[PDB]
């Protein structure tokens, strides 16, 4: 019933820059969201739950923003260790939904 | 703290006795109520009289001991009850209990003494 | 409890109420004044049920509704009292009124009434088997060719049980007689049905000649006539026939010759018609309400 | 407060000037009658209900109010009649150890209808799994104890509340005010008071034959004309004093 | 904090905003329609107009 | 002014049963009540004060119930050590009262 | 639809003032329509903490 899209497909910036990722929903999902990070050959990890709260043990460099339909993740500074893929999860209504997760956005940090 | 009693012995009928209740480990504070009960050898508990250890004692008596008994405090650790004209049915075991609230009457008896045996005979 | 089936099976007869069942509506005193009041009254010339007792045994359970007018043409006072309640068992509270050889006994208790209550000098009391939760009690002086007419009106409004009575020496006779209020009871219980109690005489048991009549009260407006002594002497029902309605609008008991405009008439509607647009799809309320998670 | 007492007052004279030394710092804010003239009135049935509540909850004892006390402990009817009295009782109902003897209901299936007492102690099931007598999570004991804290404001101090319910009818009076019973004077312009019925006129012996149950007497304009005095059970007429125009 | 009173427990709130007007009816009540009885005294209701 | 009775006079049950004791008052005492346990040749001990609260050091097997006029004490499980006498106290108004305590009820546990 | 505490349900009304009425959800003074609120402890309470 609710579908999610993740943009951009790819981003790239120097080590000192800031990357932003947009996750938008078909209908209003309000506050329910999660941002997931997986390294290649590694299960994904929770980063931002409730669209604002930082997960446990996560450094204070990932900032969530927005509510309702448009959500943005902002990384204030990359350190070549954040080059991975990030997904957004609706976790609002999964009664009849093809896929709660969004598409893939891989970040390339050119050191 | 303990609240042992004293002054218990065989007494002839139509006489007088003066029981003494002595506190151990503490003194009579004003926030507590030091109060008297008795128990017949084979009956239940029954209440006699009840005196407040405060500045102005709210002295209370039961209906069946309106004037037969009289309770009084003598010092900071001694409360005494004396009764006159002991009849045959006055034989009992006397417990000196302490209350837990100064509401001008016997509230829950949190503290009890070991009790003394007073009997009447000829 | 004693099973009894000797009663003769027969549908109750009916008779004419005439102009009986008028009671003082309040406690004030009025003299030489024609007063119009609206209250629960037994309509004039109505159908009141007729029961006969003699091998006739008529002790059925009748509905109470808003009120009951109870009469009795008596000799030797067979009727002893009445039973009130809803289910007349231990489930719901009930009320009892009896008049033994000494006095009245009014008790509101959780009686377990017998299937066929009755009474049997009188030395046999067979009405109830148990009564545990008794709430109210009252004691007073006893209330009581056919010669004795007993009239009663029972009302249950605002948690009060009102009883009106009148004893008159004598089918219902032609006459008019007001009902003096007798006692007020702050009972406040559910009442929907009631029964009657009889003193069957044993010689087996033989029932004397007696009868009683039951009518139901309705809300309507009367016009009461007070004489100089404050006694109700005549009354006019304001909705019986056009002539009586003419008297009511004039506030007089005699209508002079002429034409009088009393009221207006209306064709009361019969059916109810509703016409909404041509939509049948049900609104998405289960989705809004039965959603697993709501928004912040 | 949850198990409030109920007392019946009847066949006695009620005086309100005495309710000053017994209840210092009282507050007789009330409903249904002007408190200024409670002295010259008669009340048919008086019910007294007493309990102890916190200072900040005293406002909940009023018709139409909502709250923890009004819903689960003591509900008053919307058409309430009678007066309530509340006074601070810190000197009497505060203990240094802690006053853990006053209990109030905190959880309840549904709001109380007016004038109901709920003494049930059944465990409250606030979740899905049945409690079965266990007092764990989502299974709470419905009754909580007041933890009075006099160090804070008067809103955390025990207030004793007494609620009086009247009926205000003037004929079968059994509870009346503390005023005396002056001897009646006839054939004189006086302003009388018969069981709370105040009126001005001249009182004369009457030959009107009241029925044994009748009390008053009405004229055409529905104003009292003949009245029965409470004592001696006599019948009197009320006639307005002489009046007229001046030219 | 469910351990405290109901004042510390989550209450789900749904707010509806109607627009009472009787002609271009779009959402109506659950009552079913009735056949058109004519030429007699009948209580009528047309889109909330009683 | 206020008088109480304690019923039943005596009870007996196997070790696995539950005993109930009723204490009723002449007039409403509301909450103020206490349950005292007296072993033979021993001063009585406080068990239930305020009609619901367990005392200090008492096992969670004695349950107080009811308020106002009728009070019931329930023992969920006996262990042959609860065979004693139990009394109920008004502790509400002792201005003119013959005896605040109730009558005697002794429990017999037939092991 | 939303979720609020029990003591804040009185703030969802025309002309009311409070934390919820000012900063979260403000209703017009000439409001039309009906509001519905029911306790949801069984559905929206977690032992870990909601
Ligand atoms: C009213 O009584 C008459 C007999 O007087 C009877 O014929 C008629 O059927 C009764 N009406 C009703 C509605 O029972
Ligand atoms: C009386 O009983 C009827 C049905 O037996 C019920 O509908 C009604 O609500 C009851 N009234 C009261 C005041 O209990
Ligand atoms: C009113 O009572 C008197 C007795 O004093 C009587 O003579 C008179 O007839 C009565 N009035 C009527 C209309 O009967
Ligand atoms: C009762 O009222 C009568 C009226 O005259 C009076 O004489 C009598 O003294 C009163 N009784 C008492 C006890 O006041």
Coordinates of C-alpha atoms in Angstrom, one line a residue, chain F:
Chain F
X1 CA -20.8 2.4 70.0
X2 CA -19.3 0.0 67.4
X3 CA -19.4 -3.7 68.1
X4 CA -18.1 -6.6 66.0
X5 CA -18.5 -10.3 65.7
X6 CA -16.0 -12.8 64.2
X7 CA -17.3 -15.9 62.3
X8 CA -16.8 -18.8 62.0
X9 CA -15.9 -19.9 65.5
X10 CA -13.7 -22.7 64.2
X11 CA -12.4 -23.9 60.8
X12 CA -10.6 -27.0 59.6
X13 CA -9.2 -28.1 56.3
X14 CA -6.4 -30.2 54.7
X15 CA -3.0 -28.7 54.2
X16 CA -3.8 -27.8 50.6
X17 CA -7.0 -25.9 51.2
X18 CA -7.9 -22.2 51.7
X19 CA -9.6 -20.8 54.9
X20 CA -11.7 -17.7 55.0
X21 CA -12.7 -15.7 58.1
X22 CA -15.4 -13.0 58.2
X23 CA -15.3 -10.0 60.5
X24 CA -18.4 -7.7 60.3
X25 CA -19.1 -4.4 62.2
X26 CA -22.2 -2.9 63.6
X27 CA -21.6 0.4 61.7
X28 CA -19.3 1.4 58.9
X29 CA -15.6 1.6 59.8
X30 CA -14.6 2.1 56.2
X31 CA -10.9 1.2 56.0
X32 CA -9.6 1.1 59.6
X33 CA -9.1 -2.6 60.5
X34 CA -6.4 -4.9 61.7
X35 CA -5.9 -8.7 61.8
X36 CA -3.9 -10.2 64.7
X37 CA -2.5 -13.7 64.9
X38 CA -2.0 -15.2 68.4
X39 CA -0.1 -18.4 68.9
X40 CA -0.8 -20.2 72.2
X41 CA 1.5 -19.1 74.9
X42 CA 2.7 -16.1 72.8
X43 CA 1.6 -12.5 72.5
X44 CA -0.4 -11.8 69.3
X45 CA 1.3 -10.5 66.2
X46 CA 0.1 -7.9 63.6
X47 CA -0.6 -9.4 60.2
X48 CA -2.9 -7.1 58.1
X49 CA -3.2 -3.4 58.9
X50 CA -5.5 -1.0 56.9
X51 CA -7.4 -4.2 55.9
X52 CA -5.2 -4.7 52.9
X53 CA -1.5 -4.1 53.7
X54 CA 0.6 -7.1 54.8
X55 CA 2.8 -6.5 57.9
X56 CA 6.6 -6.7 58.0
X57 CA 8.2 -10.1 57.7
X58 CA 4.8 -11.9 57.0
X59 CA 4.7 -14.3 54.0
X60 CA 2.5 -13.5 51.1
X61 CA -0.2 -16.0 51.9
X62 CA -2.7 -13.9 53.9
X63 CA -5.1 -11.8 51.9
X64 CA -7.3 -9.1 53.3
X65 CA -10.5 -8.1 51.4
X66 CA -13.6 -6.0 51.6
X67 CA -14.1 -2.6 53.2
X68 CA -16.7 -0.7 55.2
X69 CA -18.8 -3.3 57.0
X70 CA -17.8 -6.8 55.8
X71 CA -14.1 -7.9 55.9
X72 CA -12.7 -11.3 54.9
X73 CA -9.3 -12.8 55.5
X74 CA -8.2 -15.5 53.0
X75 CA -5.3 -17.9 53.5
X76 CA -4.3 -19.2 50.1
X77 CA -2.2 -22.0 51.5
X78 CA -1.7 -23.4 55.0
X79 CA 1.5 -25.2 56.1
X80 CA 0.5 -26.5 59.6
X81 CA 2.2 -23.5 61.1
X82 CA -0.9 -21.2 60.6
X83 CA -3.0 -23.1 63.1
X84 CA -3.7 -20.3 65.6
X85 CA -6.2 -17.7 66.7
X86 CA -7.1 -14.6 64.7
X87 CA -8.8 -11.4 65.8
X88 CA -10.1 -8.3 64.1
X89 CA -9.8 -4.7 65.5
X90 CA -11.9 -1.7 64.7
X91 CA -9.3 1.1 65.3
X92 CA -11.9 3.6 64.1
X93 CA -13.7 4.9 67.2
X94 CA -12.9 3.8 70.7
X95 CA -14.5 6.6 72.7
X96 CA -17.2 4.4 74.3
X97 CA -16.6 0.8 73.2
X98 CA -16.6 -2.3 75.3
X99 CA -13.9 -4.1 73.3
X100 CA -12.1 -3.1 70.1
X101 CA -11.1 -6.6 69.3
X102 CA -13.5 -9.2 67.9
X103 CA -14.2 -12.7 69.2
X104 CA -11.9 -15.7 68.9
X105 CA -11.5 -17.8 65.8
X106 CA -9.0 -20.7 66.0
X107 CA -7.8 -22.5 62.9
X108 CA -7.1 -26.3 63.0
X109 CA -4.8 -27.6 60.3
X110 CA -5.2 -31.4 60.1
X111 CA -1.9 -32.4 58.5

